[PDB]
């Protein structure tokens, strides 16, 4: 009505206040919107797209070589091929993924991850890797025997070129992360005139139950 | 310890991601010493700072309304009763050449008259592109490479409404809030340092996306 | 007869986003059984004892195995405190369940931080230094806002308290967070005449209720 | 409407004004609330819980001994064991109770109190105490005979270990308190090889009709 | 003389008990003499003063929204047109290092721009804990004893929006009103003097809860 | 209602703001409008000549 009192918060500019302001050009008609393919209304859709993990993020490795996990014929048995933590937020292989980049724009996230492994050796190459997941409680397994006792997958190259690993739950707050280890279950076996070295490409993504809390500017740029 | 529940989906939306009023320019209206201009012309640049440029370049096409807030004061934070004119110069309109040029009196250039002692002026600029969306990436030639003139949003010419020099510099902090944002065609986040303001140019010294570690088998950095 | 803490029966946690993808382990009688701790000797000069939960069962039997080798834990407890006193013994014990029993240090008028032996006394428990302030700067007289039972040697020699899971989170780490403390404090000191047993045994029996574990290592 | 007058009380910050202010983080979704046992929505529920009275609050008594009323074999008869005022607000035994602590956060209170006595002697010990209540009008009774004429309870140890006394009404304003006295109705009687000394624990609480007015900061801390 | 009636139950509620805006911090923005910082970072502490710490520690778990009011002036109570920035730094966000650090321009840190001549700025901070409630008592280790990091509510970084030193100290009185409070698991009120800010530590010289009297039979102190 | 906060954009004169202002001469009745031929309500009609 006509009687009025001005309360505290009068004449303040709060940068997060979603108020209304008068249009600068009233009766201006913007260009009508045509259909454009590929509209996205959520960053979780981008989090759910598989992107390459930079697992070979070692000193001296440059360029596309950092995206390849080397697999070769081993003199020793039951050796560890590669390990990485399933931690989208912190520095490491997940920095190269879309979910890893989006998590740095937020403070807290939780949900299930998805890791896919792609074997890119010859059609004639065969063998087994043991892919083991260790929950955030424990440290890295010391032997293939120890890794076989926890959550693991035995992966055969000659049958399946790709396997999906699902990490049941990770979380972060203002890391509590598991570890993925790849073991040489068998020797790398090839016929004659076949390369004895191959690569594994690791991809990472978020599941349908991943979420983000408290938007926070990134420290990458 | 561990976030047992989910954080919801509201803050992962594109609308929330590109929201909140953010500093897009610090405009100085110099009136003293060697610089007695008494006015400034500021081109509206949504990508003035790298933090906002990287967030916007997650999209290819983007349609939104912009709300601008001008936070103005003197060098010593004082806000006396000085009268200021905030003129919006629409794309393809002449810009002021001096403190008392005739473009300050053009009726088709909307103006805000506000005092420094008033709460900050606020106004909404609509979607301005001749196309259905703003193009952060245009792969072609106007008739330099990649320089689309459809992303011109206009100019904010700011002056003190005064006859001769006042001897006082006015600092104007321009805050912009993106409204009703629609984004098309997700893109990878920029991983290289920006070299120039309008190009994807990067230095030959290429930085690795992921931080280095000692070996592919160790989990300590 | 039985004190139900906050009028809340212990139960299994409702559906959780984290527990939906991998259903939590619900152990049976093998884990949810009676654990009888070492007996405490109540004497005239005794100041009282306290135990942390589930720190008291963290290195004991199958429950200790589950607690150490699981990332997350949730359980209620049924605790029995029994005395073996003659009708010629007199004294009053207060049995109190203190949720988030943070033990304070005492600074000489400088130990401002209690050591691990006081914060996590284990299955043997810890004796009170200042039972008047419960070793936590809060008066013993007002400790009856917590779930409690009296043991008056002339009326009853046993107390039973059922404590449900009480936390700001549906699950937590058993090894580094104690949900509640169980304190037994002699209010009226033990008195007896020459020729009686000089100590009254105090026995604590614990039964985990609706134990839940997640993320086996 | 558009016409408006600002009244007195404009631009004032009243610390008790329950107004509305804009959220600092709009679209932030707090952690959803799980069920937690032991929610309390009223300080009167805490006032109605029995807590130990510090009746033995004498000079030189330290620690848990201050909560115990000593009872022993008396050479004389009809002696007074202990007395205390039923005054939750002022200094004395009620300071150690929850109702005594809450009353110091308020200026005015009224209602009925509840006092429970617990005998903690041997099962073999027997005797009688006379528990007398004097209303706020009178002074402390001088003899057990005088106390027997007013409101009183004769309490036998051998039959009941605990008795509840109800004070019909106390009040306070910006003390008008009664007095409780404990008399030796009989001698303390024990068989041989039984301690001749025992203790009474006094507990205090508020009834369902107790209330509090005008919230006032405490002088304890 | 005597309050014959009952006082009602409204003021004994937990909602009323923890209500009314109260001083939680006096922030000094020093800009002159030996301290020419021109800014201050104030950690949000609901338990800054012992009076409020004792009232909050009546509960174990507590969930609420906080409304903050900034009452700002100079040394001599004057309020000229100086412009101030009140930045809220959410938990787990970087804090300003200086008067012109880049964190002052971070869009995800909400800011209030207000003049000293304006009525006091006011804003609501939501429930911020990763848990369902704030824990005043956490009996455990993060991985010091009893130091739960889930009670971080954020930081208020306050500066004058100025280029060089102004020579004026600004006193900011921060007032906080708890809103929509829910409390769990009642606890005894603290009876010992607080030694440190984050611990239940007390001195070996233990003070008696009840004031002393001459004898258990006398009613005069 | 009676409680009120003034937002940014208070006390600003935006030259394109189509607000309301009080009449200088309330109860003044302008000359009634007669029919005049050749009313035009659009510049596109002139563009089409």
Short mmCIF file of C-alpha atoms in Angstrom, two decimals, chain F:
data_model
loop_
_atom_site.label_atom_id
_atom_site.label_comp_id
_atom_site.label_asym_id
_atom_site.label_seq_id
_atom_site.Cartn_x
_atom_site.Cartn_y
_atom_site.Cartn_z
CA UNK F 1 3.03 -4.48 1.58
CA UNK F 2 4.63 -2.30 4.29
CA UNK F 3 8.01 -4.18 4.42
CA UNK F 4 10.08 -3.15 1.38
CA UNK F 5 13.62 -3.34 -0.04
CA UNK F 6 14.88 -0.97 -2.76
CA UNK F 7 16.73 -2.92 -5.48
CA UNK F 8 19.48 -1.80 -7.89
CA UNK F 9 17.93 0.46 -10.57
CA UNK F 10 16.31 2.65 -7.86
CA UNK F 11 16.50 6.43 -8.60
CA UNK F 12 17.79 5.85 -12.18
CA UNK F 13 16.42 7.73 -15.19
CA UNK F 14 16.41 5.26 -18.11
CA UNK F 15 15.41 7.28 -21.21
CA UNK F 16 13.64 4.20 -22.72
CA UNK F 17 11.62 3.35 -19.55
CA UNK F 18 7.88 3.59 -20.41
CA UNK F 19 6.66 4.39 -16.87
CA UNK F 20 3.77 6.55 -15.61
CA UNK F 21 4.07 10.17 -14.41
CA UNK F 22 1.35 12.33 -12.78
CA UNK F 23 -0.55 14.68 -15.14
CA UNK F 24 0.56 18.36 -14.86
CA UNK F 25 -3.10 19.54 -15.26
CA UNK F 26 -5.51 16.96 -13.78
CA UNK F 27 -9.13 17.33 -14.98
CA UNK F 28 -7.93 19.16 -18.16
CA UNK F 29 -10.00 17.81 -21.10
CA UNK F 30 -8.05 17.95 -24.40
CA UNK F 31 -9.78 18.97 -27.66
CA UNK F 32 -11.80 15.90 -28.75
CA UNK F 33 -10.36 14.13 -31.82
CA UNK F 34 -12.29 14.69 -35.08
CA UNK F 35 -11.87 12.31 -38.04
CA UNK F 36 -8.82 13.33 -40.16
CA UNK F 37 -8.17 11.42 -43.40
CA UNK F 38 -4.77 9.79 -44.02
CA UNK F 39 -3.88 8.38 -40.59
CA UNK F 40 -0.79 6.13 -40.83
CA UNK F 41 0.23 3.80 -37.97
CA UNK F 42 3.26 2.11 -39.63
CA UNK F 43 6.42 3.17 -41.49
CA UNK F 44 6.16 -0.05 -43.59
CA UNK F 45 3.09 1.46 -45.36
CA UNK F 46 5.38 4.35 -46.43
CA UNK F 47 8.11 1.83 -47.43
CA UNK F 48 5.53 0.11 -49.72
CA UNK F 49 4.80 3.35 -51.69
#
